[PDB]
A paper describes a structure:
Of particular interest in this regard is the putative centriolar CPAP–STIL complex, as mutations in both components result in MCPH. CPAP and STIL are strictly required for centriole assembly: STIL at a very early stage and CPAP slightly later, possibly by controlling the organisation and length of the centriolar microtubules. Instead, we demonstrate that the TCP domain of CPAP constitutes a novel proline-rich-motif (PRM) recognition-domain that specifically binds to a short target motif in STIL. Our mutational analysis of the interface demonstrates a remarkable correlation between the ability of mutant proteins to bind to one another in vitro and their ability to support centriole assembly in vivo, providing compelling support for our structural model of the metazoan CPAP–STIL complex. These data strongly suggest that the interaction between CPAP and STIL is a conserved, essential step in centriole biogenesis.
The sequence conservation of the CPAP TCP domain and the CR2 region of STIL suggests that this interaction may be conserved. To confirm this, we solved the crystal structure of the TCP domain from Drosophila melanogaster DSas-4 (dCPAP) (residues 700–901) in complex with the region of Ana2 (dSTIL) equivalent to CR2 (residues 1–47). The dSTIL–dCPAP interaction interface in this structure was highly similar to the D. rerio complex (inter-species alignments of the structures yielded an average pairwise RMSD of 1.2 ± 0.2 Å across an average of 118 ± 4 Cα pairs). Indeed, all copies of the complex obtained in the structures from both species superimposed well and exhibited the same four major groups of binding interactions as described for the D. rerio structure. This conservation includes the contact made by the E792 residue in dCPAP (the equivalent of the E1235 residue in human CPAP that is mutated in MCPH). Although the overall sequence identity of the CPAP and STIL proteins between Drosophila and zebrafish is relatively low (∼22% and ∼13%, respectively), our structural analysis revealed that the interaction interface is conserved, confirming the previous proposal that fly Ana2 is the functional homologue of vertebrate STIL. Despite the many sequence changes between Drosophila Ana2 and vertebrate STIL, our work suggests that the interaction interface between Ana2/STIL and dSAS-4/CPAP TCP domain has been retained, highlighting its importance.
Residue numbers in the entry: 11 to 24, 65 to 204
Write the structure that this text describes.
């Protein structure tokens, strides 16, 4: 805490002044340059870091939002364990507690990956409706939108 997070990279295309306001809301000025704003109720918090980074803590919504100012990226944490990354190009990365990773590319293609079963290496869902299933052994299952099922073997 009080130190900024290290900015993530998208997945490959392949002295201590604690001012208390009249309403009850607090503003804390830190020596490093940080400004911590607390709501009167103490449920909504926001840390304005020296490097222009923002950390929003919503206790009512159970969310931790982080803005990486340099890279124009958003990171939302949820109570259930879900982490959502939002990149400037529209790329969104979803990471759950189990280990499932869901990349939403700007071309509306979705990449699904889970190192649990590893029967199936990676799953793909395209804009047209095509569903590609890559297997660990090298095999492929292509589910076309028209109803065609392609079974690719060694």
């Amino acid at each position: 805490d009080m130190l900024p997070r290290l900015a993530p990279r998208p997945s490959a295309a392949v002295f201590k002044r604690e001012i208390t306001n009249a309403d009850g809301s607090k503003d804390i000025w830190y020596p490093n340059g940080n400004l911590k704003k607390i709501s009167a109720d103490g449920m909504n918090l926001r840390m304005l870091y020296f490097n222009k980074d923002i950390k929003e803590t919503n206790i009512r919504e159970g969310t931790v939002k982080y803005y990486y100012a340099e890279t124009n990226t958003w990171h939302t944490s949820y109570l259930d364990g879900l982490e959502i990354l939002e990149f400037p190009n529209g790329q969104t990365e979803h990471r759950r507690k189990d280990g499932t990773v869901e990349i939403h590319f700007p071309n509306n293609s979705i990449k699904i990956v889970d190192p649990s079963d590893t029967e199936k290496l990676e799953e793909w869902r395209y804009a047209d409706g095509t569903h590609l299933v890559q297997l660990r052994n090298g095999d492929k299952i292509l589910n076309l939108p028209n109803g065609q099922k392609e079974i690719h073997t060694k």
